[PDB]
Amino acid sequence: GHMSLSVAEKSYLYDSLASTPSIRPDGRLPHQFRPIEIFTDFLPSSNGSSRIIASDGSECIVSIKSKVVDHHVENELLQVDVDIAGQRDDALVVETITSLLNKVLKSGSGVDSSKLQLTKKYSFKIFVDVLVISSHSHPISLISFAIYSALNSTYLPKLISAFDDLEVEELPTFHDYDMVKLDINPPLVFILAVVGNNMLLDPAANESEVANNGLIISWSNGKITSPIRSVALNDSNVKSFKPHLLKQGLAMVEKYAPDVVRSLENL
Amino acid sequence: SEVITITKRNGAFQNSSDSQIVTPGELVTDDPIWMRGHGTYFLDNMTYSSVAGTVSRVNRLLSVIPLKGRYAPETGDHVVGRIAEVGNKRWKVDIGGKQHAVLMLGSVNLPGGILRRKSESDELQMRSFLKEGDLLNAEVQSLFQDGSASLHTRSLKYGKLRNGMFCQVPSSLIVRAKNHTHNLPGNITVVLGVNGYIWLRKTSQMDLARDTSSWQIYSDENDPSISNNIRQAICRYANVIKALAFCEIGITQQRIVSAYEASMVYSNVGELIEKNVMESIGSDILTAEKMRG
Amino acid sequence: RRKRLADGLSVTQKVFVRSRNGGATKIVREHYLRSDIPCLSRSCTKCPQIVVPDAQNELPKFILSDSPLELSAPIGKHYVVLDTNVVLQAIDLLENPNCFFDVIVPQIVLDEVRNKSYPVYTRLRTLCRDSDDHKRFIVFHNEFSEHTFVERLPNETINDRNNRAIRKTCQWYSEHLKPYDINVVLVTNDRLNREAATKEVESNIITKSLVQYIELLPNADDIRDSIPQDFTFPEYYSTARVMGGLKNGVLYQGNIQISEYNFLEGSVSLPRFSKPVLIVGQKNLNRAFNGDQVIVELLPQSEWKAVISDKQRRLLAKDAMIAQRSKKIQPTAKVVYIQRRSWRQYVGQLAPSSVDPQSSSTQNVFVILMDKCLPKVRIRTRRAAELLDKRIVISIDSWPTTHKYPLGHFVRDLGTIESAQAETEALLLEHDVEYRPFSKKVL
Amino acid sequence: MSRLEIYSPEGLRLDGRRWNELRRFESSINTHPHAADGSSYMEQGNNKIITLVKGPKEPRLKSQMDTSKALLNVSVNITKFSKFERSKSSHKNERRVLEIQTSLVRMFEKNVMLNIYPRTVIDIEIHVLEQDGGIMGSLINGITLALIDAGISMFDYISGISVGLYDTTPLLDTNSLEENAMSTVTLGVVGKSEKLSLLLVEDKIPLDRLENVLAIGIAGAHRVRDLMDEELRKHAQKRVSNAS
Amino acid sequence: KDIEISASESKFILEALRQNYRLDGRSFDQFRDVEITFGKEFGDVSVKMGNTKVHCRISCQIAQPYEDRPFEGLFVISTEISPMAGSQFENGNITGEDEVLCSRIIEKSVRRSGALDVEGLCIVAGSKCWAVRADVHFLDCDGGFIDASCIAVMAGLMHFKKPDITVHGEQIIVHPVNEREPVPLGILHIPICVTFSFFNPQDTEENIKGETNSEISIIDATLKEELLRDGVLTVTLNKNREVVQVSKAGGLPMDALTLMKCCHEAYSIIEKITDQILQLLKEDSEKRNKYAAMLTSEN
Amino acid sequence: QDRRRLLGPAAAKPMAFSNTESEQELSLHTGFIENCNGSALVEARSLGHQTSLISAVYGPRSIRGSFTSQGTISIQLKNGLLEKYNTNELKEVSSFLMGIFNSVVNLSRYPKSGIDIFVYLTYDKDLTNSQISSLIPHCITSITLALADAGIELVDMAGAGEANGTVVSFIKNGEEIVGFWKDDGDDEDLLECLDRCKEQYNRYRDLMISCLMNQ
RNA sequence: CCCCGAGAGGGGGUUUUUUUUUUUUUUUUUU
Ligand SMILES: [Zn+2]
C-alpha cells in the first residue's frame, strides 16, 4: 500500500471496520462513495478529455485521440495507455492496470465497436491516454470514471467519401468542420474492500491498508461483466475469503452501480 | 438515498485592516541599520525579500513572513511524529518538516523507568520498544545547526500513541499554546501537534488526571474495551477537524467541541465529509467569533 | 467562449479538420479579435486615430479615393466589395484598367480564393499591392475585426456563414462611410445573398449580380465582353476517387501531348511505363489541353491499338507493361481528371464565319486561338463587328460534358492584324513576356 | 516558401496578433495543494502546463544527499497528446527532454537559495498537457510560479519568452505554425534586469539580427514578469484578507 | 567520483581572474591553438587543444532510408565518454547533465544545421542509401570538449571520402578505392563552436540587483577554469556571418550586450579556425598526391 | 540493432507460414534445479493444447531496501521458446499470483527476507490447427510445488481450476477462495464454474501431495 | 561546535548497487 500506519492504528481501524455494524473512519456507509469533481472538454487538441479530482487529492487526466486504421490488419481498435506519475512505465502496478483496462474496453467485449467503423475497410482507432497525477490507493476505479466521462464527450471527424473500398476504392476524406459525437457505452470499474465479513465500496487509503482482500468488478450495459479480479489492497494482511463474500460483492455492485451511473450520466 | 456526489464542469481545466505584501526580488527598504532576517537578502543598503509574504518589523529586525511553507520546528514544541527509521542508538521520526527529527535512545523512558539499571542490551533491542510506523508524542528538546529538531519523550505525558486514529491538517492551522492535549465530550481526547499531526484517542486515566503501567507505555495493543459510541464519536470529531481545515481556519479546542455539537443536526456521520456541510459549518464558527469580537 | 484582453483585443477558437493521406486531424488555432482594423479610405476621419505602426515602424496608407467612380443614383459615389466567385471567374475584368477602381476585398474572400486557386490569389494581391491613381484594391481583415466577425449559427453551412460574413462587412462599411456619402456595392453571383436582403430585416445593402452590376456602369458596353460565362462527355471522377486511385496503383498522372497533326490522339508520359500510353478518341481525351497534367485510367485490353476490381486493374497494368516491351500492340487509356490545367490568357481572332453582320443583339461567335494545337472557343458578344479584324485576348470559363466546345469570354483588344503595334504585343505575351512598365514600388 | 500570410502587409499575423503582443497569459497558483508543497497551472496561448514542487523534504536515498545544499531535480513529462498528431513513443528518455530538464535545473540552481536547505531535496514534476509553440518559455514561467507557491526562497523571478524572426521582422510569443516557418530564440530573463539566465537558439539566425531579437524578447519577458507578479499579489491579497 | 577543490584553489583562480590572469597564461579572449592531424584513412582526424585530445572517425555503410525520408541518407554522431579522459567520467554515462548537453550541442551544430548534405547520401530513392557515422573519442580532457568535438566532426566529414557506387536495379556494386577513386561528402556549411565560461567575482546579490556589471567571461576554459565557473555559453557560427546555434542553458545570469559581444568575438575565432581547417586539408591532399606520383614513378 | 545481443541483419524478415467436458492429465516433478532453493516441472496435455512450464523459487534471501517483520514475495512470469504473451498480460497474472500466495505463505517466519518466485512458460503449444486463463491453474500448481520443495511454510496446499474463462483458486478443502479470475465467459454462470474448478482443484491437490510425498 | 549533571564526568554531529536507441506539420558574344 501507500499510507504508513502503526500496528495500533491498524488494529483500531480493523476492529472498527470488521464490526457487525461496520464503522468507517469517516462515518460513511458500506455503499457510499466520497465526493468527486469532474471536468470535461478542456483539451481542444484532442477528440475528448476528462479530469477527475478525489477528496484526498487524487487526480487523474484522460485524453481521447482518434486515428483512421485498416480494421483488417488492426485487431485492437481501442488502446489504453496508463501513466502513473512517480512510477516507471514498466512498473508492476502500471502494466497491470494497463492490461486490465484494455480488457475492460475491448473492441468486442464491453464496447460497441460498430460506432467506430467508417467504411468496409477503414475504422477509427481510439487512443485512451491516462495520466495519474496523484493517487493514494488503487486508482483503477478513479481512472474508470474519468475514461467514462471522456468517452461520453468525445467528438470524431465525419466521413465524406463513399463507404465501399472493395469496388470503387475511394481515399478516406472527411468534412472540414462538422464532427459527429461518439455514441458509445463505456464500462465502469468498481473496487471493493474486504474487511472481515464486511464489503466496502470506494475503499479509502487507511481502509485498504487493513483490508483482508479486495475485488475489482467491471460494469457494462446494466449488468456485471468481466474483467472481475480479486486483488490484495495491501500485502501484510491478505487472507482467503468465503465464497459468499464474493457473491455479496457482485450483488452489492449490481444494485449501487446504476446510482453511480445516473450521477455520472448527467446532462 | 444518494449513491455518490459528482460535480461536473465543461470546457475548463479548473474552476475560476491593511497588511503589507511583497514578492521575491521586491525592494523592502534601503536602511542599512536593519538586521536582515529570514525571507530576505541584501546588497549594501538595499534589502530585498527572499519569499512571497508580509513584511514584518519587530524592533530593529526586518523580516518577511512567508505565506506558505512546511512546519518549522521551534525548541519546546509539542509534536506528533511517526518513526521513519531506526539506526544505531537513535530513532528518526517523521514530523512533517524539511528533515526527519532525531530521537536518541537516551531521552526516552525505558521500561521499569528509573529503577532499571542502564543497559547495553537495549540499544540493540530498541526496535522492540519502538519501530517503523509507530506514532508518538514528543517535545522538541533542541535544534541542530541547519534547523533540524532533536526530540525527547522523557515524560509520562509523552510516548507511544494508541487507542485511536490519526489525521493531519496544515501546520499553519495549529499554533503554539500552553497545552496541546485536550479533553472533549464523548470521552475522547485530542492531541494537537504543532506540526499539524493530530491524534484522536479514547480518554485515558492520565487524560483525566491532567485536570484532576510503566512497562506498557510502548504497547501497540488498543484498549480491548472500546465502545462504538467512542468509535463513532472519533469519526465525528475527525470529520469536523477536516472541515475546519478545509476552510483554512486554525483549529481550536473550543471550535472543535462547538462544531461537534453543531454537527449533531446530521443523523449519519458519513455526512461530515461533504463540502456544503463544511462550508456552512465554517461560516457558523466564524460568525460566532465575530459576535464575540 | 470569447475572452476580452487589455488592448481591447479579443480571442476565440478556430477549429477545423484537414484530411491528409487518408488521415483525419483536428486542427485548432486561436483566433484574435481586434478593434483597430483600418477601413483604408481617404474619406475616413476616425481610423487614422486608432491605427498602429508595422514591425518596420510604418503606418499603413489609406488608399481608397475620397471621390470614387460616381454612378447613377441611388448608387452615387461607391466602393465595390467582391464575392469569392466573382473573383475566381472574372479576374481578368478585375485587372481591366477601364473598370473597378476602388475595390474592397474581405479577408474571408482572400482566404477562399487562396485555397481554391493559388494563382488568382497572387494576381489579386498584386492588385492590392500595385495600387496607383487608376486602380485601388485593399484587404479588409473582417475575420480579425470584432465589429464584423460573425460565428457559425446552429445548423448553418460554412458557405452561408461566409456569405453572411461578407454581407456583414458591406453593412459595416456602409454604416461606417455614411457621413462621407459613399455607398457600397456588393458584386456577387450567388443566389443565397439576395433572400437575406429581400427581407431587409436588420439593415440595407446594395448588391448586384456581376452582370447586373456591370450594367450600371458608364462604360457598360466597353466591359460587358469581359464577363465570364446525344453528346456528353463522361464526368470527371470525384477528388477522393483519384487520390485513392493513385495510391492503389490504379490511376496514373502525367503530362499529356497533343500534336497539331492529330487532335484525336494524345499520349501521356508515365513513370511506371516505358513507352508513353496512347489516348485515342475525343471522349477519351476528355477536354484535355496540350501540356496539361492529367490523370488517366487504363482501358481494357480489347481497346488496345496499333475489369472491375482493383486487383484486375493492377494486372491490366502489368499486361500493359508487357505489351509495351513486345512492340506489337500498344496500351490505351482515358483521362478521368485534370490535375493541373496549362491554361493561361489566350490570344486569338474572331472567325468571320460565325458572326452575322445583320444581327444587332448579343450573338454567339467563335474565336480562333493562335495556338494551332488548341480548339476554338465560343464567345458571347455584342461588339462582334468591332472585334472582327483584331487580335483579341480571351479566357476560358468552362468545358462541360454536354458542350462540344469550351466556353470563353473576351478580356482585351490588342489591335488590328499585321500591324506593328498589335503583332508585337501579341508576340510578346504569347511567349510570356512582361512588357508593362515598372510599378511604383519598383521605381 | 510559405503560402500562408505569416506577416501580412497590414501588420497582422495568422492568429490576429501584431508583432509585439503576448498571448493570453493566464496563471494559476495553489492548484494541487494535496499533491505538492507548491503548484501552478499555466495557460500561455494553447499551452497547458501543470507544475508540481515537492519539497524541501528528506531524500529517499542517503547516498544522494548534500550537507551544504538541497538537491534540485526537474522532470518534464511531455504527454503523447500534447500535439495534434499523437506521438507513438514516449519522450521520457528522449535526449531532447533530458536537455530540457538539465537546462531548467541549471537555471534555478543560481536563483533558488539551495544553500539554506541543506540535507534536503526539491523535486519538480512537470506535465505538459497541450503544446503550441514557445513551450520552453512556458516551462520557465510554470516553475517560477510553483516554486514561489511552495514558499521556497529565491533571488528573483525568471520569465521565459520566445521570439521568431520571419525575414527581417521579429515576432513576439510565437506559436507552432510560426516556429515551423522561421527560426526562433528562447530567452529567460532574470527579474526586470537585462541579464539572461537562458539563451537558446536552435535554428539559423543572421548575426546582425540577433541583438535586436534579444531586445524584443527581454522587453516581452518583462511583461510576462509583470503578469506573473500581478496574479501573484492578487492571490496573496485575497488570502491575506480572508486569513486576517 | 568527485573532484575535490580546496577553498584556497577556488579563491586563487578567481582572484587571478580579477587581476586579468589565467593559469595557462592565455588571454580572456584567447582561444587555444588547434592542431589537426589526419590519419592514413579518410575520415580519420585527431584534434588537439593544449592538453585536450579528441579523435574522430568517419565511417559509412549501405543502408535503407526511413519511410518518412526516402530521398535522405542516414547520419548519426556518437560522443560516448570513457574513464580514459578522466575517472570523473562514468563509462557509458549518456544521461548525465553535461553529457546530454554536449551531445545536444554537437547535434544542433552539425545534424540539425544541415552541415552535411544528406540528400546526396541517397543512392536509390526509398531503397538504398549511405549511412554516415561520426564517432568522437574523448582521449584526454582539459576542457573545451564541445569545441574540440565540433572541429573533429567537421574536419573528419570534409576529409572523408566514400567509395563509388554504381546501381542497376536491385543490385549494388561497391567499387573498391583502388579500382576507382572514392567520392568526397557534400558540405553545405562549416559550423564551428566557441564556448565561453562565466565567473561571478562577487556575490549573487550583486549579480541580481547590482548596478554595475562585473562578471568575468573567458574563452575556451581549461579543466580547472571549467570546474570553477558559474555559467556556460556555447555559440556556433560559420564564415557566412550567421549564428548556427546558441546555448546558454541556465547558469550565471549574464548581460545581454555581453552575450552579444561574445558572439562577435567568437566570429573572429571561427573565421581563423575555418581557414585553418581548409589549409590543412589542401596540404593533406597535396601530400597524398605527391606520394601517389612518387609511387607511380618508381612502380 | 542491439549492442547487447546478436539479432542478426535488420533487413531480415521473420518466416511467415501459409496455407496450401474433456478430461485433463498432468505430470509433476520437483527439485531438479540445483541453482535455486525450490523448483517444479508441470506438464499438462488435453484436447488441442499442451503446456510445459517450469517454476523456480529463490529465497529466503537478503533484502537491501527495507526492514521487515515478515517476508516479501515477488513473482515473475517469463515467455518461453515459441508461444508469446503480452508483457502486460504476464504482469497481470503475476499480480494475481502474488495476491494468492500472500494468503498462503507463512510470511511471519521470514523477517527481512525475500522470496523470489520465477515461472518459466517454457513450452506452450496451441494445436487448434485470452489464452492465458488456461495456464493460470498450472502456474499455481507449479509455485505451490516449488515453495513446498524449497521448504517455505504454507498454510495450505493452494490449487485452482479453470472453466469457461473463469479461474478460481481454493484452499482448506475448497471451503474458501484465495483468488478469483474471470475473462469473457457467459452470464450467471458463477455457480457452475465454482463446482467445475473445485473438481480440478481437488484433483490437482491430490496429485501435488502425491508428488511431494512419494517422489 | 551541540545536548544532560554545577565544577575537569556522561551522550550525540548523520557513507555505498537494479532495467537499450527515434523524436513535431537549338551553341556562343555584344545588343
Ligand atoms: Zn474608417
Side-chain angles (χ1 to χ4, degrees), chain A residues 42-46 51 55-57 59 61 63 65 79 81 83 85-86 89 127 129 131 133-134 136, chain D residues 31-32 34-35 48 50 52 54 60 77 79-84 86 90 92 125 127 129-130:
Chain A
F42 55 87
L43 299 180
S45 182
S46 300
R51 171 178 187 247
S55 61
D56 53 17
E59 176 168 328
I61 301 178
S63 177
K65 306 210 74 172
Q79 167 183 334
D81 181 90
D83 174 19
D89 290 331
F127 298 94
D129 294 330
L131 173 60
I133 301 296
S134 179
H136 307 276
Chain D
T31 63
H32 300 72
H34 293 58
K48 295 178 180 53
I50 300 182
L52 301 184
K54 302 179 180 181
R60 293 182 183 174
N77 172 228
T79 57
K80 298 176 182 177
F81 55 88
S82 66
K83 293 179 179 179
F84 296 155
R86 166 178 151 88
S90 177
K92 190 180 184 63
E125 303 186 14
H127 302 271
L129 303 185
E130 190 171 337

Side-chain angles (χ1 to χ4, degrees), chain C residues 37-41 43-48 62 172 176-177 180:
Chain C
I37 302 298
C39 55
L40 299 183
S41 173
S43 295
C44 184
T45 59
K46 302 191 301 179
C47 296
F62 292 74
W172 183 94
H176 182 62
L177 297 171
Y180 319 113

Side-chain angles (χ1 to χ4, degrees), chain C residues 3 5 7 9 11 13 25-34 36-38 40 52-56 60 110-111 114-115 118 121 125 138-139 141 144, chain D residues 4-5 7-19 21-24 26 43-46 48 84 130 132 168-171 173 175 177:
Chain C
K3 298 292 180 65
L5 307 184
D7 289 345
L9 213 64
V11 54
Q13 202 83 309
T25 312
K26 180 182 175 182
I27 304 297
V28 175
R29 305 198 306 256
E30 46 186 346
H31 184 72
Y32 288 89
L33 302 177
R34 314 198 56 81
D36 58 330
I37 302 298
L40 299 183
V52 294
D54 61 356
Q56 288 74 19
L110 188 68
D111 286 15
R114 182 181 62 241
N115 300 330
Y118 296 138
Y121 159 78
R125 261 298 186 188
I138 64 172
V139 177
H141 289 264
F144 290 157
Chain D
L4 299 180
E5 293 183 347
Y7 194 69
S8 64
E10 293 76 16
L12 294 179
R13 296 198 273 178
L14 288 176
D15 51 282
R17 291 180 303 160
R18 313 214 88 89
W19 83 278
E21 290 181 351
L22 297 176
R23 292 173 296 180
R24 182 182 65 198
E26 293 177 350
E43 281 199 0
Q44 185 171 350
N46 287 334
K48 295 178 180 53
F84 296 155
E130 190 171 337
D132 192 21
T168 61
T169 304
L171 298 182
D173 202 349
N175 51 40
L177 279 77

